[PDB]
Design a protein around this ligand. Structure first.
Ligand code: HEM
Ligand code: HEM
Ligand SMILES: Cc1ccc(-c2cc(C(F)(F)F)nn2-c2ccc(S(N)(=O)=O)cc2)cc1
Ligand SMILES: Cc1ccc(-c2cc(C(F)(F)F)nn2-c2ccc(S(N)(=O)=O)cc2)cc1
Ligand SMILES: CCCCCCCCOC1O[C@H](CO)[C@@H](O)[C@H](O)[C@H]1O
Ligand SMILES: CCCCCCCCO[C@@H]1O[C@H](CO)[C@@H](O)[C@H](O)[C@H]1O
Ligand SMILES: CCCCCCCCO[C@@H]1O[C@H](CO)[C@@H](O)[C@H](O)[C@H]1O
Ligand SMILES: CCCCCCCCO[C@@H]1O[C@H](CO)[C@@H](O)[C@H](O)[C@H]1O
Lengths: 553, 553
């Protein structure tokens, strides 16, 4: 009595429920389809799919015809296409979340419990013949061998788009505020209950820790003065839990919101940048409101930083990644006339695919000197030895590593790539083609169609056996890319939805929160509308270095 | 240097922010008004208010013209008017939430922190001349004296609507799942973090307690067999925290989700009803899915009960209370084409006004025998001595007490009425007329306009002094009512919004959760669509008594 739902019968986001001893049914409610499987099109959906261009065809448009986009950008079409990218990508990702590691069905414990990582698709029944449902071999390839043959870096393959390490560290820094898989509770759980841009990696992840980081005067945060410059406080001044190595001295270890940030001068660099940005905002709010107290000056400055984050993440961060000629625009008012939920729940496949370790180089250049992985990791003095302005100049002048296609993952951080595929099997993620179906994409018929070449494709036909049994994480990294893209179709087509929901799904974007008084007048509401990666750095420094998400070139 | 925001300048939901030493400004963003105070109408809003009938005029329509509503009910207009009541009413309620006891401004702590009771309006700055802003006497009336002169019951004044005690106990039972003001954290905090219909008073309020209440087989809940009937388990069987009297003599103390439920046979009666309803649903789900396990059978049956609750709360509970000829209809699909947030946050004024102790009679009739407050409170054996069917028959045959107008609060429960007005001053709620402005109502110019008579009205002119300084809670109960109504115009026009937002704001109503598979096929999705107060009782009993929200008459 083989579980009928192991064949993934339900198509187009159909929920498969089990009936009787060996029966089943598919709920085709509002999926645009009917019938036993939700395959037979409705009158309107049939017309919509017939006039639907391939995802790659629309990517070609958004990456070609400069002249056309010089016009579109300077017209109201920048909003007709922006709102279209927003609503359409983010549709109904389910909102309110739908599953988690413990449940493969809509439940109140899944919507109420935040300590869970939601999941767009259910897991593969523990009662299914093969590990990935019905297709593939009885055993899946060795995680270590997959990383030493298809993910291991031989020669450095830079990003064709020019992306630099300044972007690489902004990604790891801004992404770790909603990715805190908890050791204790194990995989499928998170410590960052913000599940979005709550700047928990600056103040969070909890309140008890927040106060320890706050100076409690002028709504500022405690700090430390080294070489007449501003950095985070020493753990002595502000005693909070940090995952520093050793050992070490307490006087030389800075404290922030997100831990494991002291294990990289890059993450502590942005911890210093946003720190000076918070206190600077408190100086602007104190002058405007002498009557305001400590609590209001802080919690207000926090909303101002959260606004500057999304502003730089859309109009800058995704603009370098995207490579499009369409100027991405952060304007919450685009979905003010749309049926949109201002809620967000971090998925386990968003945490899964966001492991962009290929971005890390072979080493780390800093002007004349060159530090290796051994000299750069767990560095305590490097941050204060070079300063902020001199360091931001180095990262912006060094290219990062291409994420898609492979094989481009340094041998140092490859142990994470294996702990990601290992965590994939623990969560029991579905195959690669099943997720392709979920994000409006046609499944690959062969391994050669995935990589675009015969050599690895054949080396995979031996391991997995079937294409419908290919793993999720390995599928994204081994997929070929468009001519000068940073990663495969699937990384774009699956990642775009998740991030767009989480940005505009933020409370501040809603009609209730997107006022001028919410940021303490027009002064604070302008800082958000003019937020730039260049002003986030230079305004807090003395000298103005080279700051960008792409190398000079 | 008087705080300018103490005059409540901002009109029509305008946010007042303080500037300089003695200045201020009003944020008129999307309030439909502009100018210094948001008083000048916009082109469209001016036309909307000109064609806006008084709330009492629309009340009159919804309570008259029987012939017209016999037609409307049997037409698609039941949906045109239902959706209209939904969207319009619930749009007065901010979402996401706005403020809480600790903050008088939009902040991330206020949206992230759930242990808070949100609040529709900010508090009265402690740096204001008079306790209620600028109007009124330097001191507010004695809480005890107000309850002994305007709330104390002399002669029993029944509800003109026929409402009975069956409704009175369904109100206190269904309302205490989102009202758990924490005694530890003090006023302005809640233990029920569900902030809605999470049936936390059955399973909740937490997970550790939930397992203790569950049998862990067939997704059922532990129980106890007394006289061949089904009741909740003894604490011995299921050890959970309960607030039974001191040195109370268990065995015989039943355990449920919501505590302080053993202090009333009425609350333990509904704890038994919903208990048999959960296990019965598990029998229907087990037959349909023999393969299903314990976890899925329970968490699914939980969504089925949550659905039956809102179904009975709209088409039955608010039917009685409203006494409108318009058949209220629970259909989540009404706001599927509306800009609605499926989120909810319990306000402190919703907790405030929902104190309907006037509903409690002088005594409690049970067929032949009559028990007083001393014989009925903290009763442990009464529940199992009469059974379920014999008791539901008694409550449905006894009228309750009218809530509005006063003075109709038994001398036994009057100590709560004083602890509600006392909690009002702790939270620093705004005056009565200020909240009237918030919920689309014109402020009262005199105390005589509130009560509708000269005798109390004068006694109040002496105490409060000004009408703009009248307290919130006392304002609702002392307000006259339309002759056959259960409470004043303000109780309707402020409670209707809160209630409606929390019912359809529930996740299950959303487009993602409102499927048939979410309830385990059509079987479970039908139990929700045909949920009745009569089927909730009779189906779980042997004999069928008189069950309703109104006396026989
Ligand atoms: C020197 C560079 C880096 C090092 C040493 C590093 C180290 C690690 C380690 C040890 C883990 C543990 C995963 C596991 O135990 O399964 C991890 C996971 C992760 N990596 Fe990195 N990483 C680096 C760069 C990056 C970058 C550039 C990104 C960009 C997005 C990134 C994204 C993530 C995320 C989101 C997780 C999981 C977060 C969580 O579960 O809390 N990492 N990394
Ligand atoms: C015999 C009947 C009742 C008894 C003995 C009772 C008892 C109490 C007591 C002692 C409090 C403490 C409140 C304070 O200290 O300020 C309370 C709170 C409250 N009561 Fe009742 N009550 C009864 C009926 C009702 C009814 C019929 C309703 C609504 C229909 C109601 C609604 C509330 C609400 C909303 C609170 C707020 C407490 C919280 O937020 O946890 N009560 N009750
Ligand atoms: C994780 C993730 C995935 C996709 C996106 C995204 C969003 C958008 C936009 F425009 F919709 F905002 N584009 N866009 C995107 C599009 C193409 C590329 S590429 N270089 O791989 O071809 C890179 C990014 C962002 C984040
Ligand atoms: C706390 C509270 C307050 C109002 C309502 C409500 C909702 C509705 C409806 F129809 F919109 F659903 N009516 N309605 C209502 C209307 C009038 C009265 S009455 N007894 O003063 O005439 C009683 C109830 C419900 C709960
Ligand atoms: C199904 C009845 C539609 C109206 C008659 C038009 C001809 C049938 O329309 C069709 O229906 C199929 C359904 O899968 C479509 O896929 C095809 O276009 C066609 O066979
Ligand atoms: C001209 C481009 C404006 C429209 C933006 C289309 C968004 C990308 O395109 C579409 O995205 C949808 C969301 O992933 C998916 O249904 C499709 O697979 C994809 O093509
Ligand atoms: C026609 C709609 C706008 C004008 C309002 C007319 C009603 C005046 O207002 C209302 O009239 C009701 C009449 O039944 C009275 O019962 C209400 O108390 C009265 O306030
Ligand atoms: C048929 C009678 C009117 C029902 C449709 C209109 C919706 C009624 O809801 C209306 O809400 C407004 C704002 O919440 C209030 O000011 C009105 O008094 C209230 O009746």
């Amino acid at each position: 009595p083989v579980n009928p739902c192991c064949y993934y019968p339900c198509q187009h986001q159909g929920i498969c429920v089990r009936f009787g001893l060996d029966r089943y049914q598919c709920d085709c409610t509002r999926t645009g389809y009917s019938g036993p499987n939700c395959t037979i099109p409705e009158i309107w959906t049939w017309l919509r799919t017939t006039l639907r261009p391939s995802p790659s065809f629309i990517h070609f448009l958004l990456t070609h015809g400069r002249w056309l986009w010089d016009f579109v950008n300077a017209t109201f079409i920048r909003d007709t296409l922006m709102r279209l990218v927003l609503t359409v990508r983010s549709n109904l990702i389910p909102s309110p979340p739908t599953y988690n590691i413990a449940h493969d069905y809509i439940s109140w414990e899944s919507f109420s419990n935040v300590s869970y990582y939601t999941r767009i698709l259910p897991s593969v029944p523990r009662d299914c013949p093969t590990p990935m449902g019905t297709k593939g071999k009885k055993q899946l390839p060795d995680a270590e061998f997959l990383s030493r043959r298809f993910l291991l870096r031989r020669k450095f393959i830079p990003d064709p788009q020019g992306t630099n390490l300044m972007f690489a560290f902004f990604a790891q820094h801004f992404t770790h505020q909603f990715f805190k898989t908890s050791g204790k509770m194990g995989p499928g759980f998170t410590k960052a209950l913000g599940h979005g841009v709550d700047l928990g990696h600056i103040y969070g992840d909890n309140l008890e820790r927040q106060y320890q980081l706050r100076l409690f005067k002028d709504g500022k945060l405690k700090y430390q003065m080294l070489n007449g410059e501003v950095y985070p406080p020493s753990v002595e001044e502000a005693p909070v839990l940090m995952h520093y190595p050793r050992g070490i001295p307490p006087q030389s270890q800075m404290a922030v919101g997100q831990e494991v940030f002291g294990l990289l001068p890059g993450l502590m660099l942005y911890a210093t940048i946003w720190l000076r940005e918070h206190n600077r905002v408190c100086d602007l709010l104190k002058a405007e409101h002498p009557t305001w107290g400590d609590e209001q000056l802080f919690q207000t400055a926090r909303l101002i930083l959260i606004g500057e984050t999304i502003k730089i993440v859309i109009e800058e961060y995704v603009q370098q990644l995207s490579g499009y000629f369409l100027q991405l625009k952060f304007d919450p008012e685009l979905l003010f006339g749309a049926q949109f939920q201002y809620r967000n729940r971090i998925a386990m496949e968003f945490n899964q695919l966001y492991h962009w370790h290929p971005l890390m180089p072979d080493s780390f250049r800093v002007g004349p000197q060159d530090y290796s992985y051994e000299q750069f990791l767990f560095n305590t003095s490097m941050l204060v030895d070079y300063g902020v302005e001199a360091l931001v100049d180095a990262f912006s002048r060094q290219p990062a590593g291409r994420i898609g296609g492979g094989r481009n993952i340094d041998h140092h951080i490859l142990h994470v790539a294996v702990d990601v595929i290992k965590e994939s099997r623990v969560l029991r993620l579905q195959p690669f083609n099943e997720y392709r179906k979920r994000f409006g994409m046609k499944p690959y018929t062969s391994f050669q169609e995935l990589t675009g070449e015969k050599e690895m494709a054949a080396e995979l036909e031996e391991l997995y056996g079937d294409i419908d049994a290919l793993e999720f994480y390995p599928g994204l990294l081994l997929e070929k890319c468009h001519p000068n893209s940073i990663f495969g179709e699937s990384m774009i087509e699956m990642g775009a939805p998740f991030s767009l929901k989480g940005l505009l799904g933020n409370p501040i974007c809603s009609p209730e929160y997107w006022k001028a008084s919410t940021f303490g007048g027009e002064v604070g509401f302008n800082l958000v509308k003019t937020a730039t990666l260049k002003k986030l750095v230079c305004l807090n420094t003395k000298t103005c270095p080279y700051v960008s998400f792409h190398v000079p070139d």
